[PDB]
């Protein structure tokens, strides 16, 4: 059980794992156009942290993009494959992700969530009440009136995992 950061570096190994992650994202988010998932996962501004089983099988992951000078990151997609859900991997992934964001000097995580995900993100400590001013994300994150933007503050000295 490894949680490795994967980026489009053009090797066959990382590419196969990024396609496997894209395939988990489309099968677990069927409302999402599959061509839109491909475009963000393989965009040079996005990175993906995968949950690697036996150092070769991707069973989950989180695709995100950092706004390094602004110190915030928006979570693109997050999913765990169906046959590996309710095994606590999703929480271990979010904790490993927040630990990496703390090391990347990222202060806030933002994500658009609607319906059930408002609840899953509230359990991972994301709130609908923002602490970060609206003008800090405007012009970097898209303002949709159709979703609920949730934010999680990453304090520099909180330990993330249990």
């Amino acid at each position: 059980l490894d949680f490795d950061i994967l980026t489009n570096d053009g090797t066959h190994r990382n590419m196969k794992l990024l396609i496997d992650l894209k395939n988990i994202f489309s099968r677990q988010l069927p409302k999402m156009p599959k061509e839109y998932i491909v475009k963000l996962v393989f965009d040079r501004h996005h990175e993906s942290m995968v949950i690697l089983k036996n150092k070769q099988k991707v069973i989950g992951g989180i695709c995100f993009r950092q706004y390094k000078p602004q110190r915030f990151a928006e979570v693109a997609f997050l999913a765990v494959t169906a046959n590996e859900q309710v095994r606590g991997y999703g929480t271990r992934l979010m904790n490993k992700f927040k630990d990496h964001m703390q090391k990347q000097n990222i202060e806030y995580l933002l994500t658009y969530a609607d319906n059930f995900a408002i609840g899953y993100f509230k359990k991972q400590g994301f709130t609908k009440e923002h602490r970060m001013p609206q003008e800090k994300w405007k012009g970097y994150i898209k303002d949709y009136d159709g979703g609920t933007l949730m934010e999680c503050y990453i304090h520099p000295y909180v330990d993330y995992g249990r």
Binding site: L29, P30, K31, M32, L40, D43, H45, H46, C63, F64, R65, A73, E74, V75, A76, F77, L78, T111, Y112, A113, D114, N115, F116, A117, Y120, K138, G139, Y140, I141, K142, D143, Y144, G147
Partner: peptide, 19 residues
């Protein structure tokens, strides 16, 4: 906005699933 490169927003309908 009117990005066409930006970050990403999910597609969580509601977890009892089919689309």
């Amino acid at each position: 906005q009117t990005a066409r490169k930006s970050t990403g927003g999910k597609a969580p309908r509601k977890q009892l699933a089919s689309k």
